[PDB]
Amino acid sequence: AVQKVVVHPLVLLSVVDHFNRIGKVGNQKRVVGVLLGSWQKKVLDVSNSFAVPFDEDDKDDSVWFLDHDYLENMYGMFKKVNARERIVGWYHTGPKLHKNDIAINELMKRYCPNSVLVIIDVKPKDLGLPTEAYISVEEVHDDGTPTSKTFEHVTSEIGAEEAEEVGVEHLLRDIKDTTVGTLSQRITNQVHGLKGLNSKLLDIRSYLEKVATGKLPINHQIIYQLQDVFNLLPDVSLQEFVKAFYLKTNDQMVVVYLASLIRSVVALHNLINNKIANRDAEKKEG
Amino acid sequence: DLYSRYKKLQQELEFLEVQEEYIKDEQKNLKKEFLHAQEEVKRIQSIPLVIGQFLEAVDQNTAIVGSTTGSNYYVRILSTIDRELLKPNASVALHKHSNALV
Amino acid sequence: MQIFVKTLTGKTITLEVEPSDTIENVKAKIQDKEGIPPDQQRLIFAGKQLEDGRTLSDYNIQRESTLHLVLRLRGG
Amino acid sequence: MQIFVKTLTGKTITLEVEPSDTIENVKAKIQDKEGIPPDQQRLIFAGKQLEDGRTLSDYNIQRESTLHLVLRLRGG
Amino acid sequence: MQIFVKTLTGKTITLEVEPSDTIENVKAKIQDKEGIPPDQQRLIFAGKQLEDGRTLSDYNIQRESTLHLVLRLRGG
Amino acid sequence: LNAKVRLLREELQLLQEQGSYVGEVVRAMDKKKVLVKVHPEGKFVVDVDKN
Amino acid sequence: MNLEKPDFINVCQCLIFLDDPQAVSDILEKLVKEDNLLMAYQICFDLYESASQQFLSSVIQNLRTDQTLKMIKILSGEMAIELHLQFLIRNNNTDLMILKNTKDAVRNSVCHTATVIANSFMHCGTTSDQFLRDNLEWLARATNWAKFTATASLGVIHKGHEKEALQLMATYLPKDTSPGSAYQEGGGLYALGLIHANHGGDIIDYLLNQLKNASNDIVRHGGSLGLGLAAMGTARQDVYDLLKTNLYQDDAVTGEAAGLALGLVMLGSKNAQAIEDMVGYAQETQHEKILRGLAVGIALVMYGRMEEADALIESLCRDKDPILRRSGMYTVAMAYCGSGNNKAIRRLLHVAVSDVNDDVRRAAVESLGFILFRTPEQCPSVVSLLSESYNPHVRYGAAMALGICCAGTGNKEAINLLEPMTNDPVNYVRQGALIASALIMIQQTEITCPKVNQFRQLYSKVINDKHDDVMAKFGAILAQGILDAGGHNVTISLQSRTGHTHMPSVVGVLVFTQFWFWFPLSHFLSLAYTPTCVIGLNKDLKMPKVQYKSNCKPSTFAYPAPL
Amino acid sequence: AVDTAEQVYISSLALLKMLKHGRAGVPMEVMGLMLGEFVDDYTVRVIDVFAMPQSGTGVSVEAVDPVFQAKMLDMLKQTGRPEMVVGWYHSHPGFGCWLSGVDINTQQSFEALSERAVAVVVDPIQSVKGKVVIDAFRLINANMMVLGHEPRQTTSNLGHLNKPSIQALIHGLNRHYYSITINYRKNELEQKMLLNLHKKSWMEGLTLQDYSEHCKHNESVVKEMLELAKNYNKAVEEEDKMTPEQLAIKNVGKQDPKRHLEEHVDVLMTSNIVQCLAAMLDTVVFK
């Protein structure tokens, strides 16, 4: 099992390189490759990757063709250069999971029992993080329906190390932002947050509306119980909570009345000195 | 007569307005540059550096210090340290690479 | 669909092709009648750099267009 | 309402649209008019970059308003 | 007997030899044609590093054989 | 404001510099040469600059 | 016209501001009918010296479709060329001592070529070769691309010496003397280009043939600059085809040559096809040189079109590739030339203060000059504060914007600002300030402005020092040649005699400032020197002797520097 | 023909690779190959880098066996990167960046085999905080220097920044080799996978931490500002009829108003305004 994955920039950049270059061999929608990495304790650190030739068909999910021998050879050479990394998993691009993917997983799970799948979305989007990480497990599924194999999400984060961040910071020198910000960076964040929240809430419709149309079957087992919980969890303004009004005012009597004042007295002092000096320097020449 | 004065007044008014907007913008960017520069200067001693011991002060922002590895050196000093703490001897910090006093 | 290829030598050569073809096929036809190895062929269209992996329709190429062939001289 | 858009080469294009139209719908309309892929286009009003997640009513793009369009001259 | 020597830069170099020739003679030919000291050349055929004590009649080489050359790169 | 930031930038530029040794002179020499004795060890013949 | 008499003022100004060639041709014919020939001659000379090209074409065509010869010849310019050359060839009196000194002081670096440029400036239009003739074992020290510059320089000595042109150039036997160089052939066509500027005449149909056959490396570079120079502004389609085909060949050294020349012929035509084809080839290419060509070649396609260009601007200004953004700034410069429009200033200042890439900051702030020169008293008030920003590029741009705004007149405040900057620590900004001062003080004597004998000495300090940076003395040795142009008899201005913006001068001085990126472009300054004289005449064929009389002069002004 | 002031374009990815590998084997030197294209008569573009088996030591390196190199090109070629090699690079652990006398003997073989192949040198432990010490060189032949001919050709973009270091100038600079200008052409797409990426958040934009952790902060800052203010009062009561030049005369430190009084105000204002605004948003976005 794993509680989180940590991804280094180098893999992200190499994936972009792969996706740009592949046009040299034959048009394809997506690309596939191995991830190398290491285990500390229930946290997984990824640090390198390499291409592997792959081909697909756009309709039939029974047809595809990975390649064993290229994989084994290249891993041999990489191991001959360095020995501390080992096979850890694989990645593909494309924005949405393909039905086919489990069938690939049960292949290369043979090279590492805990094969984890990372999706990297190469083309941009506004709302947030670029990558997702998934792990494969069977389930009880129900009171009683066939057990199967599907993925579940695992939380994901982007990492860094010494002498990889220095190159990044050099590349990014031309475009920079305030480290902390003074009401010009905190205020923007709130707007960004509201964008994300509204995105999620709108995405709920596209499912729940079409299930109400009956276009697809009800996943009664899970979704509705969670969305009963949700509608339960908001709060309310109930005469007792509003009695914790007595906190807004105690912010203001530290802001307004004891920080503005000593910001005006300084300005008067500077003005007095300025007028004194300027008039003195006038009459001195007269 | 008065027509020319009227027109020229209009023109110079609007043109000094343009200059005013320019100056506001340049103020806004120079502030950011100054902030960034202080940010760079802050990380010049947050380093695993070495201990020397103060030996002599020649003039402003310059001194002579003998490091604990022998090899007596002669180096600038940082612009933010207080001066009246380093007369006879002291435990001073020396940059690992440049031997700049911090 | 005929297409005209121009070399740096001043020669113009006309190849009949169909819009379904792909750049490597054209380079193979060149290797046919030019005899220059396909790896030693580089093709520019209107300043763009063509890829061996794609179809003609990806570059909107129409009838009788001119393509420029350039050699690689790193072997000096 | 009828509105006009101008482009690099100066061609002026006429679109008839309704206030609730979203920016992706406008993109679809203009690609229907001229076949440009909807990603190869960006549109500008006043000084600010229009973004897709909103209706024309949100920016209150008035009747007969003029828009600027920016594009690569060809998709490649 | 004509043979082809490739290199990592894409340079290709034909050469004429006879199967009685010993390998160091080949490295001498490379030296005189290119201008490279015999120490610095290392030779590969079919994935085996060749050795001076042997003729090209050994290693059963045939004409039009593709050898590879690699440099003795060092630093310090 | 511009003067202030320019000054700070110049100071940071200067701090990126290499150190120097200190040496005892035992005697001068002719045609711009001195004989010095660097602290750890050594007995060198060094050249003077233009100033 | 209802007033008692016909006149110049209305027909000079209004008919070319309105662009009504039919009306001027009609009133000209009417003035011929009643046999008032002196008016009909003065109007022709007045017109040619300030009417645009192609305007003359429509006028002459409508006219001709006897007095015909003596009016057509004065209308196309031939005797104006003759007379101007005849003035310069007689009033020449340059002082060779300065060349002898700088020649003796030079060390064998780049400064060598910097000499043979400036020399050609001072002997411009003078047809005298002496400095390149009395010594030759020194000039033969040049090799490689330098041979291209030096041999091109003859083209600026013989400027306007059109009549014999071709026989002269082959007289150097550049091709026969040895096939062992292509750089000479490359220079020859450039020289023919410089001699026949604007007057494409016959030579277009010769260059257009000679460009057909090429050792494509260098010969095509010379050829395309020459042909793009001879035919500028005519929009001739048969030329444009051949330059497009050379551009599409996609070769670095032949890149910006055609990139310019394809821009010169279309100048101001607003041609909606050329812009889309050129911008489409600037995107999705991968050689910087071609972009550094098209950076200029685009902007010249729009000229004075003002608001009718805006649409392209705020397209081109959005592009990510920085050379395109710079070319956007050049376009907003040319669009509004001379016209003090406010919002263009607002844009240029915002860009200069904000953008992340230095070269667009230079090319932004530098272009302020081209839209303010109608009121040179105003430029110092804005650029002054720029001159102290922390990053050098903005300082260089400021200095050059002063040099280009006040160019013709020794406005005191400009010198007052440039004085401290001539000692800036960063070498290339000294290189800037020297040339700016030299432009702004051409033909000024001590009584007319005080500072001259400071500067006239300062150069000879720098050029004789040896503890300095090469580029600084490059700028100095150029300033010497700028200050004594054409035997003291020529001056630089953008305004015409009567308020029109003289297009060849704007083009020449714009494309001069690219000397930063490619040295042989510096000769393009020669288009800006206008002669400064009064010609006494009583009949077109007849210069009768007269003496004018200049009152209120102690006679200590005028011709300077005999000493 | 002769060279001029040209250039080297290196991709961002290859830079990360060089830094990472150089820092890995830190007590010893490391070296590798680099792959790219001579796109025109005077720029050179390097796209990718890979290491090779090597017998490192604290002052030198040698490559072990050739078969590895010959193979890996043939592997890469069938997944879409056919470019041949353009040059090589190595690292100097603690010294300056310059060429040793053995590097010349290595380099001459590449130059004899291909006309333009640059050589690259990296320093992994001076590149510590916010700069990179990386450089590229080529040889100058001996006999040409004796003849009047100089190394190159001139156009005005030679002289920016490219002041040589004295440390490098002690060795064969100019005399034996010359530096080449370097710049990083970060094209589109890979721009965004860095700028909009290494730092980000979503729900973090709406978090409160309203317990004591806030009130205690306020009651530290105001408490110390009490003494700052008393100090400033005393420090201005002097009111002596002297001249502010004399004030500058004795001015050394702790200039109360500017030095300290104001930053406390700015900090307190920032914190409290942001907190109150966030509470006011959450009071409406959720029920």
Curated annotation (Swiss-Prot), chain A:
Pfam families: JAB, MitMem_reg. Keywords: Acetylation, Isopeptide bond, Proteasome, Ubl conjugation. Residues 5-140 form the MPN domain. InterPro entries: EIF3F/CSN6-like_C, JAMM/MPN+_dom, MPN, MPN_RPN7_8. One of its GO terms (biological process) is proteasome-mediated ubiquitin-dependent protein catabolic process. Component of the 19S proteasome regulatory particle complex. The 26S proteasome consists of a 20S core particle (CP) and two 19S regulatory subunits (RP). The regulatory particle is made of a lid composed of 9 subunits including PSMD7, a base containing 6 ATPases and few additional components. Within the complex, PSMD7 interacts with subunit PSMD4 through their respective MPN domain. Interacts with TRIM5. Belongs to the peptidase M67A family. Does not bind a metal ion. This is 26S proteasome non-ATPase regulatory subunit 7. It comes from Homo sapiens (Human).
From Swiss-Prot, chain B:
It is found in: Cytoplasm; Nucleus. It comes from the Eukaryota. Belongs to the AAA ATPase family. Component of the 19S proteasome regulatory particle complex. The 26S proteasome consists of a 20S core particle (CP) and two 19S regulatory subunits (RP). The regulatory particle is made of a lid composed of 9 subunits, a base containing 6 ATPases including PSMC4 and few additional components. Interacts with NR1I3. Interacts with PAAF1. Interacts with TRIM5. Interacts with ZFAND1. Component of the 26S proteasome, a multiprotein complex involved in the ATP-dependent degradation of ubiquitinated proteins. This complex plays a key role in the maintenance of protein homeostasis by removing misfolded or damaged proteins, which could impair cellular functions, and by removing proteins whose functions are no longer required. Therefore, the proteasome participates in numerous cellular processes, including cell cycle progression, apoptosis, or DNA damage repair. This is 26S proteasome regulatory subunit 6B. It comes from Homo sapiens.
From Swiss-Prot, chain G:
The keyword Transferase does not apply. The gene is PSMD1. Belongs to the proteasome subunit S1 family. GO terms for cellular component: azurophil granule lumen; cytosol; extracellular region; membrane; nucleoplasm; nucleus; proteasome accessory complex; proteasome complex. The modification N6-acetyllysine is found at residue 466. GO terms for molecular function: enzyme regulator activity; ubiquitin protein ligase binding. GO terms for biological process: proteasome-mediated ubiquitin-dependent protein catabolic process; regulation of protein catabolic process. This is 26S proteasome non-ATPase regulatory subunit 1. Keywords: Acetylation, Phosphoprotein, Proteasome, Repeat. Component of the 19S proteasome regulatory particle complex. The 26S proteasome consists of a 20S core particle (CP) and two 19S regulatory subunits (RP). The regulatory particle is made of a lid composed of 9 subunits, a base containing 6 ATPases and few additional components including PSMD1. Interacts with ADRM1. Interacts with ZFAND1. It comes from Homo sapiens (Human). The chain holds residues 206 to 817 of 953 of the full protein. PC repeats lie at residues 149-182, 187-220, 222-256, 257-291, 293-326, 327-362, 363-395, 397-431, 432-472, 475-507.
UniProtKB/Swiss-Prot annotation, chain H:
Signal peptide: none annotated. The modification Phosphoserine is found at residues 127, 201. Component of the 19S proteasome regulatory particle complex. The 26S proteasome consists of a 20S core particle (CP) and two 19S regulatory subunits (RP). The regulatory particle is made of a lid composed of 9 subunits including PSMD4, a base containing 6 ATPases and few additional components. Within the complex, PSMD4 interacts with subunit PSMD7 through their respective MPN domain. Interacts with TXNL1. Zn(2+) binds at residues 90, 92, 103. It comes from Homo sapiens. GO terms for cellular component: cytosol; cytosolic proteasome complex; extracellular region; ficolin-1-rich granule lumen; nucleoplasm; nucleus; proteasome accessory complex; proteasome complex. The keyword Membrane does not apply. One of its GO terms (biological process) is ubiquitin-dependent protein catabolic process. It is an enzyme of class 3 (hydrolase). Residues 8-143 form the MPN domain. Transmembrane segments: none annotated. InterPro entries: JAMM/MPN+_dom (IPR000555), JAMM_MPN+_peptidase_M67A (IPR050242), MPN (IPR037518), RPN11_C (IPR056263). The modification Phosphothreonine is found at residue 243. Belongs to the peptidase M67A family. PSMD14 subfamily. A motif (JAMM motif) lies at residues 90-103. PROSITE patterns: MPN. Its EC number is 3.4.19.-. This is 26S proteasome non-ATPase regulatory subunit 14. Widely expressed. Highest levels in heart and skeletal muscle. Keywords: DNA damage, DNA repair, Hydrolase, Metal-binding, Metalloprotease, Phosphoprotein, Protease, Proteasome, Ubl conjugation pathway, Zinc.
